[PDB]
Amino acid sequence: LGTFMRADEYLKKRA
Amino acid sequence: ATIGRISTGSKSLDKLLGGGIETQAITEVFGEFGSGKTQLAHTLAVMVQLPPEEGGLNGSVMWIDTENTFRPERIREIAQNRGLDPDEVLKHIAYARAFNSNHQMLLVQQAEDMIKELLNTDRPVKLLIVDSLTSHFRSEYIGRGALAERQQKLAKHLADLHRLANLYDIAVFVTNQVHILAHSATLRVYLRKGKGGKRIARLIDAPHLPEGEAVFSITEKGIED
């Protein structure tokens, strides 16, 4: 979150 | 190097743009809340991944938010409705949220590392989105004499973005919420609401524009005519 992440992993993180 | 052009999803808007948004350029879209800016950013993040006969560049995406704007499910929807695998499209978008304007500047440096990594693969970065590009600069540099420093810092950030666009053959796409302040994008596009739920686009200060306005809708495919 302080740096880039792949959007599929981001979706999972936010869930 | 040849300029690439990414379709917006709207033939009307693509025509206004001379075929699509250009690599080796910064395109700025600006307008009021609800004018379509974020929807255009989400659509481009899908379109750039298409092959060129579908308006894309077989490209990867990097996305810097300043506010909480990016919606992975909206990407999935747009992709699914255009005949793509929604989850595969997500694997080709790298996302970061800028905490403040200084972090935003660092993120651009980090973006260069991924751009270099992917450059000679079959899915090089072809689109770098910065949403609400000025929002932190406007909140942090405020008050008497802040104009000079704010605009100087912005100019540097924009120079860094121009360098990435030109050095790595990327389209840089930035959005801003509503002169007299300086602007440094290659191309500025004003968006507004029209009748019947449409959005209207106009090029600002682009005399090599064949004159006109584009009209488009926001749908389950993102942006289309």
Numbering used by the authors:
A (entry chain C): 94 to 108
B (entry chain A): 108 to 285, 303 to 349
Publication passage describing the model:
We focused our attention on human RAD51, an ATP-dependent recombinase crucial for homologous recombination (HR) and for error-free repair of DNA double-strand breaks. We therefore explored the possibility of using a more stable orthologue as a surrogate and focused our efforts on archeal RadA from Pyrococcus furiosus, a protein that was already structurally characterised and is closely related to human RAD51. Here, we describe the complete process of generating robust, RAD51-like surrogate systems from this archeal protein via two distinct approaches: by stepwise mutation of the surface of the RadA to humanise the BRC4 binding area (HumRadA series of mutants) and by generating an archeal/human chimera (ChimRAD51) in which all of the BRC4 binding part of RAD51 is stabilised by parts of RadA.
Initial analysis suggested that at least four residues surrounding the Phe pocket needed to be mutated: I169M158, Y201A190, and V202Y191, K221M210 (we will use RadA residue numbers to match with the residue numbering in our crystal structures, but indicate equivalent RAD51 residue numbers as a subscript). Mutation of these residues in the monomerised form of RadA was used to create the first humanised RadA protein (HumRadA1). This minimally humanised RadA mutant could be expressed and purified similar to the original monomerised protein; its crystal structure confirms the success of the mutagenesis and shows that the binding site resembles that of HsRAD51, with the side chain of R204194 moving to the position found in RAD51. A 16-aa peptide (RadA-OP) corresponding to the oligomerisation interaction epitope, as seen in the RadA heptameric crystal structure, was used as a probe for RadA-like interactions at the oligomerisation groove. We have also determined the crystal structure of HumRadA1 in complex with RadA-OP, which shows that the isolated oligomerisation peptide binds to the ATPase domain in a very similar way to what is observed in the heptameric ring structure of PfRadA. The FxxA epitope straddles the central β-sheet, and the C-terminal end of the peptide folds into a short α-helix interacting with the oligomerisation groove. All the peptide residues that interact with the domain are in identical positions to those found in the oligomeric RadA. In particular, DSF showed that the introduction of the K198D187 mutation reduced the ΔTm by over 1 °C. In line with the expectations, the ITC experiments demonstrated that the affinity for the RadA-OP, being relatively robust for HumRadA1 (KD = 1.8 ± 0.5 μM), was weakened by an order of magnitude with the most advanced versions of the surrogate system (HumRadA33, KD = 14 ± 2 μM).
